[PDB]
Amino acid sequence: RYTKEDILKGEIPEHIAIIMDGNGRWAKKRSLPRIAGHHEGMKVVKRTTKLANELGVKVLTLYAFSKRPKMEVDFLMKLPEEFLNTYLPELVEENVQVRIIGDETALPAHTLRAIEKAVQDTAQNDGMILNFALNYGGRTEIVSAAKSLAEKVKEGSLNIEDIDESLFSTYLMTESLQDPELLIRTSGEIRLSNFMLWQVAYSEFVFTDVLWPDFKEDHFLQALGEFQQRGRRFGGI
Amino acid sequence: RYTKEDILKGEIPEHIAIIMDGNGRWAKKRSLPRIAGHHEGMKVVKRTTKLANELGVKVLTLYAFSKRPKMEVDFLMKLPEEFLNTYLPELVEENVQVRIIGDETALPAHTLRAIEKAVQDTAQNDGMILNFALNYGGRTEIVSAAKSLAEKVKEGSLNIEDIDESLFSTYLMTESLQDPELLIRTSGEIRLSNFMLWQVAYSEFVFTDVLWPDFKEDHFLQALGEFQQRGRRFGGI
């Protein structure tokens, strides 16, 4: 419905967050193994990155889910390395900054050292930020912020009366990131699932039935079109 | 589409939260003054309370919004008193517990003393809880929880390593309430608008274009039907 051209003439949210869901359901629909769903979603991460960056998006936060059989768990823990293997050279050429939020202690040393090198390899780029949220949880992030504030208060380098909304935001894992103007959730679930609770206080939400491996350029455009037409509504605010 | 009978044979969320929006837009549609929108929404609070309580709902959290002309601001600040005036005797007979969350210091003394008496007048009831959220904000609630935890840590009655997800929940304004299984937002906006950020981490969300003064029994049923059919879906989880 919405061509690319139409979308560009309109407003482009600086920070988009996508809850990438439905990789396994896609595989089942396809009569394919579950791991083939996750691999296909990996290629969709690339196309989304490219288009969002072409579109002038400034931050793209992609959320990958967390008790499946431990062959599948190990496989997903190796996806970052495969993705970075195949797509990092064009990520540095396309001027992307690779970044990661979440509990990093949940991944093996080898996976972290691959991730951390792609990070420092793109840190001197200044284009789009590609933020991967891994083993990330909204409530845990909030509680960890409170505990670190409590510890500075305990040590006497922070006074409780100086703890305010903006200071609290500096203690979250997204401290140097503007809040997402747009959150997209694929695979038909209409929930937040413990994702960026504090940060999406005022974000527009766009839900779609489309499964993440199917969520290609046209579907991405339609969500932007949905975002834009909300800005063109009349009446009260 | 969904009769009452159908809805009852299914599962009833124990805690529902509604973002009551669209009172003014309804008035404009009706060629009526804005304050007549707010008064009509007040009568919809009653019918929703009655039906939810008949339906066996255990907690009903209703959210009323917060810079309009100061004739309209003063008018909304007097709605609690009018509502409690007209509907409290049947709220005590219908076994409802009236409760309130939010920054109470934002209302005048007379409005608080009316609210607080309706509270203690129903405190010895044990049926449905009717929770009114007034001058309530998700982020401020979270920050106030951190500041009180910081203060017990400062005084030495709490150790930082004992601050966890469940303890953090005890410091929110909804401390003695289960998280809502269902959040409903009327008037067509698909956003949270800084409402119960921590508490809706896992809630099902139901959005509707219906304006709150129009949101009567049938529309309420359809949202429950929507809630129930999500539980009957197949595939992955």
Ligand SMILES: CCc1cc(N2CCCCCC2)n2ncc(-c3ccc(F)cc3)c2n1
């Ligand atoms: C669970 C682990 C996982 C799963 C996963 N999926 C499954 C989630 C939906 C996308 C399909 C591929 N992806 N896709 C990219 C990454 C990635 C992570 C870190 C990084 F630095 C670069 C890329 C990824 N990581």
Ligand SMILES: CCc1cc(N2CCCCCC2)n2ncc(-c3ccc(F)cc3)c2n1
């Ligand atoms: C802003 C103040 C306001 C506005 C308002 N609206 C406007 C919001 C949508 C509902 C229409 C009537 N309502 N409806 C009930 C109450 C109420 C508050 C406290 C209490 F103890 C009992 C009832 C209410 N309070």
